[PDB]
Amino acid sequence: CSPGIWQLDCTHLEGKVILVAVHVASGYIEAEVIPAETGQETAHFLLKLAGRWPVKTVHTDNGSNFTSTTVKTACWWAGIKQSMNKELKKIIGQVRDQAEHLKTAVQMAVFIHNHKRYSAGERIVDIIATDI
């Protein structure tokens, strides 16, 4: 798929919110635990992702996520325009006993996911570099 396309969705576990960004073409995941499913958390996360990868267009499974002027101002500043969450939840459960805080298990599960095999982490750098 096009190299700048990401999917962003907010999922739930242990009464906390996990935001999950997926690089559609590669399967590569950036994920974080946020305290509330607010547009402020979405806006700040978009700004983070955009600084780290070339984020051209964002998709979601909940369009209403992208309606706050907070979020749109982030889409604007960064030049952004407008399945996998059960795999990650699976890995979270596997490693969950290895950590106290859910936020630690999520990053353990992102590590596992992006490096298991190519690996998602290998495909995104190959994709983004080919495009360059």
**Residues within the interface to a copy of itself (CB under 8 A):** 30, 44, 47-48, 50-54, 77-78, 98, 103-104, 107-108, 110-115, 121-122, 125-126, 128-129, 132
Tell me which of 62, 67, 69, 82 binds ligand WBV, using CB under 6 A.
69
Binding characters for ligand WBV, 92-111, by CB under 6 A (x = yes): -------xxx--x-------
Establish if 43 lies at the interface with ligand WBV (CB under 6 A): yes
Q: What is the 3-state secondary structure (H, E, C) of the chain?
A: CCCCEEEEEEEEECCEEEEEEEECCCCEEEEEEECCCCHHHHHHHHHHHHHHCCCCEEECCCHHHHCCHHHHHHHHHCCCECCHHHHHHHHHHHHHHHCCCHHHHHHHHHHHHHHCCCCHHHHHHHHHHHHC
Shortest separation between residue 65's beta carbon and a copy of itself, angstroms: 19
In degrees and rounded to multiples of 5, residue 38 shows phi and psi of -100, 160
Q: Answer with the entry of a copy of itself, ligand WBV, none that 3 interacts with (C-beta below 5 to 8 A by kind).
A: none
One of 12, 54, 67, 77 touching ligand WBV (CB under 6 A)? 77
List residues near ligand WBV by CB under 6 A. 40, 43-44, 69-70, 73-74, 77, 99-101, 104
